[PDB]
Design a protein around this ligand. Structure first.
Ligand SMILES: CCCCCCCCCCCCCCCCCC(=O)OC[C@H](COP(=O)(O)OCCN)OC(=O)CCCCCCCCCCCCCCCCC
Ligand SMILES: CCCCCCCCCCCC(=O)OC[C@H](COP(=O)(O)OCC[N+](C)(C)C)OC(=O)CCCCCCCCCCC
Ligand SMILES: CCCCCCCCCCCC(=O)OC[C@H](COP(=O)(O)OCC[N+](C)(C)C)OC(=O)CCCCCCCCCCC
Ligand code: SF4
Ligand code: SF4
Lengths: 70, 192, 115, 240, 126, 181
């Protein structure tokens, strides 16, 4: 839910580019791509940490039975 | 000489090939990367799963329009109870009390004595139709086929008092369903 | 597998004195949860009577002498506590436990059929 | 594309008079009887301190042990390679009030290893505890919970013993012979209290005991002898 | 002495049974436990006990088969009690039993005889 | 074997004519039946309108009028008697042998020996004092080998099959089908 907010403001700020794609030309297209690359570096960061994974740290443990002969 | 020497048995010995081979790694998958991803991205088995479901849409359904139609019944079917008569009109039951003693649920209450003319007849005969398990033992044990189960099933009642069938009620059922009882008795007589 | 809440191991005690310490300890545990018993079970009486009637049932068994009788009455002693804490009994059962209630003369019992 | 046959009309075999051999069904267990007898004795010889006696019936071997001999014999039958009974299938009891210890606790063990089943019998009284096999077999947690609920047997060492079948606060253990089949109380919905209440038992039609008209003659004889001829004490032959 | 052996691996290729992974050193581990059991048997259990004779019957037999069968599949078919990873736990449990068998002193006189009316059912002695 | 079967060889209602060709062109597996039973074949003579006159079947030895004494086939009264072997009888069998392999003297000298094991004899003592060959011959097996738990089914064996034989899931699916062998 928290990461929804940064990714939503990224999507909603693509709105000005939609209705002005022609008149900004290549210049506004390159800026738009750059505007997306910086946010993608965030996507890489939260993909590597696996932040959204629920994980199971509490349970699902297995062990090796090791004899301790004397 | 048996394998008791090593404390082993024929039963303990696993068949040949029981040990699993080395599980394949990512480099031993026969499918190419694109084939595995085209099936994954284009939902190969799901679109098939939809297609099989859509085949049923052009098939004849199974539904029957009860109460205008009825599902199959067989001569052995167990339903509502009825006390029968001979063709001459005399009651078939000779108050022998067999059915009362078989009845797993103790749903039958019989009180009997010598009739006014000397016959061995019953003056009280109840079935607690809310206690019967509709099991057919009374029917099997009757030596004169006095107590049977008619193929009727549609007799649901508003009050539970109406499900305490006394001797008047059961004899009125035997008259009502005599023709249908004969249908089943004629068909399944030899099998008993 | 793990045991449920407020559970205890079942051990057969062999000393008389050891049991009374367990018996006395268990008594406050009933007393401690008495307000929660009222709150969780929505009892219509203040917690004072709940503490009142708990004590009486302990005394009912006070004078047992033989040891093997002592354990079983303690084994079942714990079980009733464990069910009460964990909200396993329904409100109907607990109400009826505390909602329970001089004998008639010989003529009176004779008059109404007696026993 | 031939039309489907009408299976009603296809010819059926003709038989004259049928013959079926008549032979004692207990004979086919003969090989199983000796092998259980040998393996039953083997356990007794290994553990004379615990095995009071052993018995064989058809294809079922029973080991009779005291309550204090339970954990030992159970452990031996679980760990010994010759008899690996890792799986415990049933824990139950039975009430025989005539005997001093009425309850008779019975265990059934399964050996998926050698494809065998063994039975342990151990007695108990109303107040005497019995060792719990939960530390060995985890599957006995609920089978012991059920036996206490229906027999009141004290199980020593059980991590969580409580009612499993009967209602909470149910008084009396149902499967004891002295407990009547209809119980002591019954429930109904009381309008005044707005809740379902317990009342003493009162049957509109009292149960009818037809069991009195049982057989007055003994119905089955003394039985037959099927002990292997290798487990009977030889008769000392007469002298010249 | 401090010889530490692995009984149940917690990682590796499966053996067809869930939770029973392949054992990295099957043959040496079996030989170590068979030699220990034969050694540790005589330390605690006297000779007149049949159980001691029973274990030395096949623990010797399973010790001789392991040495002469380097192929694992020849070990299994000749012992005839499952996979080699299972035989490790059989050997281990065979070892734990003697520690308890010695403690119970289960070669001695029957500790608790049944009462005269115990194994009688409906008026007949069993 | 359980190989696929053409649709017209199954007792279900199937299309005919132009619709059969449409059905084969559009279905995934053309030999799959609709599942609606054939009206002209399924239960056509109802159970209450059959033609077979049933006759009570009777095998000869147990249904005959002759050579059919009931005590010959009265198996319910030939049940195996319940015998429990206590420690004492095990000792007596161990010391004296069995009825098949006697190890008891004859006449009154033997009758002395049997009476020894007619009262309590704890088995712990018996194994302490007896020939070690006795245990290897009577108690244990095959020269001292233990007694493995007997098998309820000496013919219970299994073997691994493969999809070309068992027809089920191929090798990739995580289950294996076991035959009898
Ligand atoms: C509506 C929007 C548009 C929708 C259509 C979108 C179309 C664009 C799809 C993007 C990908 C198209 C290119 C797919 C071919 C390149 C991927 C490929 O060749 O496979 C991955 C390849 C590994 O080769 P591999 O298949 O694993 O060989 C196994 C043999 N048994 O990996 C490699 O070794 C090299 C990978 C290629 C390098 C450049 C990428
Ligand atoms: C064309 C527009 C409509 C369909 C859109 C979706 C296409 C899905 C298939 C592509 C994915 C894939 O992976 O395709 C390839 C897959 C799997 O092939 P395989 O298992 O390797 O084949 C085995 C080896 N052979 C190649 C020798 C046979 O084929 C399918 O499962 C085909 C599914 C067809 C039925 C579903 C379509 C009808 C749905 C509803 C239409 C109104
Ligand atoms: C480049 C071309 C772009 C095409 C874009 C289309 C992509 C669609 C999704 C494909 C990915 C996928 O199906 O993924 C499967 C995901 C997650 O699977 P996972 O957790 O990663 O495990 C599997 C992958 N493994 C083993 C490699 C890790 O969950 C699902 O089962 C989602 C199924 C949704 C079905 C909803 C019904 C369809 C309705 C529409 C048709 C009537
Ligand atoms: S059908 Fe069975 S349960 Fe019902 S009245 Fe007859 S014997 Fe009793
Ligand atoms: S078994 Fe038949 S004849 Fe006998 S009491 Fe019942 S209904 Fe009457």
């Amino acid at each position: 839910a928290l990461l929804f907010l940064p990714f939503d403001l990224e999507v909603s700020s693509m709105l000005p580019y939609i209705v002005s794609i022609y008149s900004v030309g290549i210049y506004g297209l390159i800026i738009f791509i750059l505007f997306l690359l910086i946010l993608i570096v965030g996507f890489i960061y939260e993909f590597n940490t696996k932040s959204l994974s629920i994980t199971t740290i509490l349970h699902k443990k297995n062990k090796a039975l090791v004899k301790n002969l004397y | 000489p048996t394998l008791a020497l090593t404390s082993g048995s024929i039963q303990g010995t696993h068949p040949e090939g029981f040990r699993l081979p080395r599980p394949k790694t990512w480099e031993e998958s026969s499918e190419s990367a694109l084939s595995k991803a085209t099936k994954w991205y284009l939902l190969s088995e799901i679109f098939r799963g939809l297609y099989i479901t859509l085949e049923m849409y052009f098939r004849a359904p199974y539904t029957i329009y009860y109460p205008f139609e009825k599902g199959p019944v067989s001569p052995r079917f167990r339903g509502e109870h009825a006390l029968r008569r001979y063709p001459s009109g005399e009651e078939r039951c000779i108050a022998c009390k067999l059915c009362e003693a078989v009845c797993p649920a103790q749903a039958i209450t019989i009180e009997a004595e010598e009739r006014i003319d000397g016959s061995r007849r019953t003056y009280k005969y109840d079935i607690d139709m809310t206690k019967c398990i509709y099991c057919g033992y009374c029917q099997e044990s009757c030596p004169v086929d006095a107590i049977v189960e008619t193929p009727n099933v549609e007799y649901a009642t508003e009050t539970r008092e109406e499900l305490l069938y006394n001797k008047e009620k059961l004899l009125a059922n035997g008259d009502k369903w005599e023709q249908e009882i004969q249908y089943a008795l004629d068909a399944d007589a030899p099998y008993r | 597998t793990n045991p449920t809440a407020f559970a205890q191991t079942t051990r057969y005690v062999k000393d008389s004195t050891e049991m009374r310490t367990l018996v006395l300890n268990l008594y406050r545990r009933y007393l401690r949860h008495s307000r929660g018993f009222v709150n969780n079970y929505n009892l219509d009486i203040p917690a004072s009577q709940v503490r009142t009637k708990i004590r009486q049932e302990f005394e009912r068994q006070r004078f047992v002498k033989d040891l093997p009788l002592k354990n079983v009455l303690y084994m079942k002693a714990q079980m009733e506590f464990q069910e009460l804490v964990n909200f396993w009994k329904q409100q109907c059962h607990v109400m009826q436990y505390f909602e329970s209630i001089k004998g008639d003369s010989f003529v009176q019992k004779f008059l109404k059929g007696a026993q | 594309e031939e039309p489907l046959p009408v299976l009603r009309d296809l010819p059926r075999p003709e038989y004259g008079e049928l013959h079926a051999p008549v032979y004692n069904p207990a004979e086919k267990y003969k090989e199983q009887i000796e092998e259980l007898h040998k393996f039953g004795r083997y356990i007794m010889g290994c553990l004379p301190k615990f095995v009071q006696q052993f018995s064989v019936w058809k294809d079922e071997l029973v080991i009779y042990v005291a309550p204090s001999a339970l954990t030992q014999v159970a452990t031996f039958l679980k760990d010994h390679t010759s008899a690996q009974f890792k799986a415990c299938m049933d824990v139950t009891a039975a009430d025989y009030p005539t005997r001093t210890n009425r309850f008779d606790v019975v265990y059934n063990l399964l050996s998926v290893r050698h494809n065998s089943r063994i039975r342990i019998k151990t007695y108990a009284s109303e107040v005497s505890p019995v060792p719990s096999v939960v530390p060995l077999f985890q599957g006995a947690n609920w089978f012991e919970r059920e036996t206490y609920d229906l027999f009141g047997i004290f199980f020593e060492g059980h991590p969580d013993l409580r009612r499993i079948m009967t209602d909470y606060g149910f008084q009396g253990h149902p499967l004891r012979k002295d407990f009547p089949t209809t119980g002591y109380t019954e429930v109904r919905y009381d309008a005044e209290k707005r809740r379902v209440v317990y009342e003493p038992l009162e049957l509109t039609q009292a149960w009818r005991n037809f069991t009195v008209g049982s057989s007055v003659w003994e119905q089955v004889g003394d039985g037959k002898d099927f002990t292997p001829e290798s487990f009977k004490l030889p008769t000392p032959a007469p002298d010249p | 002495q401090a010889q530490e052996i692995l009984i149940k691996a917690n990682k590796g290729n499966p053996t067809g049974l869930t939770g029973l992974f392949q054992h990295p050193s099957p043959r040496p581990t079996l030989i170590t436990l068979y030699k220990a059991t034969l050694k540790n048997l005589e330390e605690k259990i006297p000779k007149e006990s049949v159980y001691r004779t029973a274990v030395e019957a096949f623990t010797k037999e399973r010790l001789s088969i392991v040495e002469n069968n380097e192929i694992i599949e020849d070990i299994e078919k000749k012992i005839g009690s499952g996979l080699v990873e299972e035989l490790i736990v059989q050997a281990n449990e065979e070892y734990d039993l003697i520690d308890k068998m010695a403690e119970w002193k289960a070669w001695e006189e029957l500790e608790e005889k049944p009462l005269d009316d115990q194994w009688t059912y409906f008026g007949k002695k069993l | 074997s359980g190989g696929p079967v053409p649709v017209f060889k199954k007792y279900t209602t199937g299309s005919k004519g132009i619709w059969e060709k449409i059905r084969q062109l559009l279905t995934l597996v053309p030999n799959r039946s609709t599942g609606n039973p054939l009206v002209k074949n399924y239960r056509v003579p109802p159970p209450g309108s059959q033609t077979l006159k049933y006759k009570d079947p009777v095998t000869i030895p147990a249904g005959d009028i002759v050579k059919n004494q009931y005590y010959d086939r009265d198996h319910r009264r030939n049940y195996p008697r319940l015998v429990a072997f206590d420690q004492t009888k095990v000792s007596g069998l161990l010391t004296l042998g069995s009825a098949q392999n006697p190890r008891i003297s004859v006449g009154e000298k033997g009758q002395k020996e049997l009476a020894v094991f007619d009262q309590s004899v704890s088995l712990s003592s018996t194994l302490a004092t007896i020939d070690p060959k006795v245990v290897k011959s009577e108690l244990l097996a095959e020269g001292g080998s233990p007694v493995v738990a007997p098998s309820l089914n000496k013919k219970m064996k299994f073997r691994l099959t493969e999809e070309s034989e068992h027809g089920m899931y191929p090798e990739d699916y995580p289950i294996r089908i076991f035959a009898q062998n």
